[PDB]
Amino acid sequence: DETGVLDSLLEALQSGAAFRRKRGPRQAN
Amino acid sequence: SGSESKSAMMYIQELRSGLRDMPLLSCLESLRVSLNNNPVSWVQTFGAEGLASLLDILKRLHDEKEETAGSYDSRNKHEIIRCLKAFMNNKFGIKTMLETEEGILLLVRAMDPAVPNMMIDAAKLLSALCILPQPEDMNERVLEAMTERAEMDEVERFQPLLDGLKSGTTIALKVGCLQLINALITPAEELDFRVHIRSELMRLGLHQVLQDLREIENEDMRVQLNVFDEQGEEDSYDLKGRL
Numbered sequence: 431d432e433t434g435v436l437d438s439l440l441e442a443l444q445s446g447a448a449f450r451r452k453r454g455p456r457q458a459n
Numbered sequence: 460s461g462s463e464s465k466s467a468m469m470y471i472q473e474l475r476s477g478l479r480d481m482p483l484l485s486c487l488e489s490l491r492v493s494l495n496n497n498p499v500s501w502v503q504t505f506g507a508e509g510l511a512s513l514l515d516i517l518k519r520l521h522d523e524k525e526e527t528a529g530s531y532d533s534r535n536k537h538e539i540i541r542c543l544k545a546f547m548n549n550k551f552g553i554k555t556m557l558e559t560e561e562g563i564l565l566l567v568r569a570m571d572p573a574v575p576n577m578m579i580d581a582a583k584l585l586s587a588l589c590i591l592p593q594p595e596d597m598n599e600r601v602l603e604a605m606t607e608r609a610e611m612d613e614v615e616r617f618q619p620l621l622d623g624l625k626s627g628t629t630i631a632l633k634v635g636c637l638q639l640i641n642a643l644i645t646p647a648e649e650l651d652f653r654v655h656i657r658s659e660l661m662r663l664g665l666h667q668v669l670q671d672l673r674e675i676e677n678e679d680m681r682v683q684l685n686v687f688d689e690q691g692e693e694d695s696y697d698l699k700g701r702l
Contacts, residue, residue, distance in 0.1 A: 431498045431499045431500075431549075432499065432549055432550055433495075433498070433499055433502070433548050433549045434548060434549070435547075435548055435549045435550060435552075435553065436544065436547050436548040436549075436553070436584070436587050437548060439586075439587035439590060439591075440583060440587060442590065443583070443586050443587065443590065443638055443642065444638075444679055444682065445682070446641075446682045446683070446685070446686045448590040448642075448645075449590075449641050449642075449645040449686040449690070450645075451590065451592070451645055451646050452645075452648065453648050454648075455648050455650075456697075457700060458700050458701055
C-alpha cells in the first residue's frame with residue numbers, strides 16, 4: 431500500500447531535489 | 460468498516476454507462492476520494508478496467524470543447540486528472556498508466572491554461588513521470604506526446620507550456636509550466652538535446668518570461684528558475700568543453 435509514491439515525486443519536484451539527476455557523461459580530458 | 464458499496468467494480472460499470480456533466484462529476488469526485496483513501500489492492504481492481512473507462516471519457520471531453528458544450532465538461536476533465544493523480548500515486552498504478560496508448564497523450568492535452576487548475580494538476584503528473592529513474596527515460600517519451608498533441612490541437616508543442624508561466628495567471632499555473640520544462644530537460648544525459656529543448660522554448664518567447672518571473676518573490680517559482688538557470692549555466696560550459 432505504497433499509495434503515496436507520486437506524492438513523494440511531487441515533493442522531490444517542488445524542492446527541486448529531482449532536478450539533481452545526471453549520470454555524468456564528459457568528453458573533456 | 461467495509462460494507463456493500465460502490466467497489467472499484469461499480470465505478471467501472473458506472474463510468475462505462477455513458478454519464479455526462481453533473482452526474483459524471485459526482486461519480487468522479489467520489490471515485491477520486493475512493494482511489495486516494497483505499498488500499499493499493501482496490502486500485503488494482505480498478506487498474507486496467509477503470510483506467511480505460513476514465514480515458515474513454517477524457518479523450519471524448521478533450522475533443523468536446525467546453526465553450527461549445529457543457530460548463531461541467533471542463534471540470535469533468537479536471538476531475539479525471541485528479542482521479543489519475545490518485546491512481547498513479549502507487550506502484551502498479553504508475554505501471555498501468557504507462558501501458559496505455561493515449562494515457563500519456565491525454566495528460567498533455569489536459570495542459571490547458573483556460574482551465575488553469577487542471578493544467579496545474581496535469582503538468583505535475585507529467586513532471587512526476589519525467590523524473591522517473593525508470594522505465595526508459597520517460598521524460599523523453601513525454602516530449603513525443605507533446606509532439607502528437609501539437610498537431611492534434613494545432614499548436615506549437617511548447618506553446619501551452621509557456622502559456623502557464625503568464626504574468627496575469629496564478630503563480631501555481633505559471634510554475635506548473637516551469638516545473639515540467641525542467642522535468643523534460645534535466646533527466647536527459649544528451650547535452651545537445653538539453654540545449655535543443657532550452658533553445659526551442661527560447662524561440663517561443665521563454666527568454667522574455669524568465670525576466671518577469673525572477674521579479675516574483677515566490678517559493679517554487681524561485682526554485683524552478685534557479686534550477687533552469689543552473690542547468691543552463693552548466694550546459695553552456697559543457698558545450699564549450701575545453702575552451
